[PDB]
Amino acid sequence: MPLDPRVEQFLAQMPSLAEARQQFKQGALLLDQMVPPPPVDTEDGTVVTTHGPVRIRRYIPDRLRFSHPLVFYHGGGFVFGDIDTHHGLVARLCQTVGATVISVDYSLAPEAKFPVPVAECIDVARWAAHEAPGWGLKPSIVVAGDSAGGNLAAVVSQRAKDESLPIAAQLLFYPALDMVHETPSKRDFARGYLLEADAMQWFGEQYLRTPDDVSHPWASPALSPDLTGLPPALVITAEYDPLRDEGEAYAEALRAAGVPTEQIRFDGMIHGFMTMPIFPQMEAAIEAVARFLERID
Ligand SMILES: CCCC[C@H](CC)COC(=O)c1ccccc1C(=O)O
Ligand SMILES: CCCC[C@H](CC)CO
């Protein structure tokens, strides 16, 4: 399927650690200014985790129409991003679904290494489940994330059982799921579609303790042999994304394990598109999220 016209243009006009973090954040700013987010009530807070205090931001919708909190983990290769860089997405998730959303500022690599952010994300999910009844919501949460954050939501969902954590659904937006295998998509779209091989490698070096960590189930959830009884899954991929094939294979695996699964590929799109509000497909995907969550209760 051909590249989306606007994606094509965006890619055509595409030109230290702390610098690179600031540059990523600048990029998200320029997108937000091009396409402003909806206004939304938010409270900033801090959750006490087993690895320290983790800043969160709670989004409260104008109208509450979904009975479970969402816990959102931002993407950025485990190295970049924060609650601000992903505000544009979370505000829309909050207002379109009409859900409370907890956006999580988990600790970034290389300062924090795998598996520290997994622990933090589980702890925040556990906190949200506990608090939920106090907000007049159900205790079971929905976990959500893009890219690296989709990795985290996938892992938190696999741990859920064992950690006595009620999760009602998982929303995976072009997640990283398999750091061991090369897929066709990872081979064929390795360069020129915003997320590249070089970057993914460098990201892995920042995040992982050793090359052995790639086969760890908390790094590569796609390797887990028993997927039965995992939470209902929405898996959104981009057609021209190195990560596409691992995402779509994992959705196929969930489906065959009897998990209620929706798998949606956005044709002509690239990685990152759900934090790029210059593309209308970002809003279409957010509408997919709201329709999927309607079916949960
Ligand atoms: C204050 C100007 C920011 C600096 C940038 C950097 C080259 C150049 O400004 C623009 O072209 C621009 C402005 C607003 C939103 C998006 C953009 C844009 O880059 O697409
Ligand atoms: C952390 C981003 C993904 C890691 C990469 C995927 C094949 C391997 O190092």
Side-chain angles (χ1 to χ4, degrees):
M1 289 258 75
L3 269 183
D4 169 268
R6 203 147 28 220
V7 168
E8 201 275 346
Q9 294 170 329
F10 172 83
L11 280 179
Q13 197 168 184
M14 190 77 204
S16 75
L17 176 70
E19 273 172 351
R21 286 183 168 147
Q22 194 59 49
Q23 286 271 281
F24 181 100
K25 179 151 201 170
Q26 180 196 310
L29 186 62
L30 301 177
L31 293 169
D32 271 358
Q33 290 167 2
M34 276 221 63
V35 191
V40 59
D41 289 353
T42 63
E43 323 183 317
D44 279 19
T46 288
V47 173
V48 172
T49 79
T50 59
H51 290 257
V54 162
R55 280 186 170 111
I56 59 150
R57 184 175 299 145
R58 185 151 84 86
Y59 290 68
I60 303 160
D62 292 358
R63 263 293 247 227
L64 183 68
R65 306 168 238 115
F66 183 65
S67 68
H68 313 250
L70 271 60
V71 183
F72 179 84
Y73 314 114
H74 72 83
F78 300 103
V79 180
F80 303 139
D82 57 33
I83 293 166
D84 297 324
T85 69
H86 280 64
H87 175 77
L89 171 51
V90 170
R92 293 178 170 80
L93 282 175
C94 171
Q95 293 287 32
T96 302
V97 181
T100 306
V101 188
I102 307 305
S103 184
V104 179
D105 227 14
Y106 61 79
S107 304
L108 295 179
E111 300 91 339
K113 298 288 219 139
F114 173 82
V116 165
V118 179
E120 291 176 329
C121 288
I122 289 150
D123 288 340
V124 171
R126 189 183 293 107
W127 169 83
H130 182 279
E131 292 298 292
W135 303 324
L137 295 177
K138 295 177 185 193
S140 53
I141 72 182
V142 176
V143 290
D146 64 301
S147 200
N151 175 277
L152 288 172
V155 174
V156 165
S157 300
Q158 287 183 3
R159 295 196 56 190
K161 44 191 65 180
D162 303 336
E163 302 286 337
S164 295
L165 165 51
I167 303 191
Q170 56 188 308
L171 315 173
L172 313 185
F173 313 135
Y174 42 81
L177 296 173
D178 186 343
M179 300 192 189
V180 176
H181 305 108
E182 204 197 67
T183 56
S185 67
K186 199 173 314 200
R187 195 218 316 124
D188 292 349
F189 309 133
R191 280 145 145 215
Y193 305 90
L194 181 60
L195 179 66
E196 305 193 314
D198 308 72
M200 290 163 72
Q201 171 68 29
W202 180 84
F203 284 139
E205 289 165 6
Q206 302 318 297
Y207 182 45
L208 297 193
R209 302 164 302 186
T210 69
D212 293 290
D213 284 338
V214 294
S215 58
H216 194 303
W218 296 356
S220 301
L223 299 178
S224 292
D226 177 11
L227 298 178
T228 65
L230 286 179
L234 176 63
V235 183
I236 291 165
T237 56
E239 182 176 15
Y240 295 113
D241 181 354
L243 295 187
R244 178 190 65 184
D245 283 347
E246 59 204 70
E248 300 183 346
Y250 185 70
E252 178 165 5
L254 288 166
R255 163 176 303 118
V259 184
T261 303
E262 259 215 282
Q263 200 298 304
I264 306 176
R265 178 195 295 185
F266 287 77
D267 311 286
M269 294 314 298
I270 56 171
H271 197 254
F273 77 90
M274 283 169 80
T275 55
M276 296 175 82
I278 54 160
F279 311 135
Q281 291 93 345
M282 158 167 183
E283 292 266 15
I286 290 164
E287 178 67 26
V289 171
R291 288 175 187 247
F292 174 80
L293 294 180
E294 289 191 349
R295 299 184 211 117
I296 287 306
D297 321 294

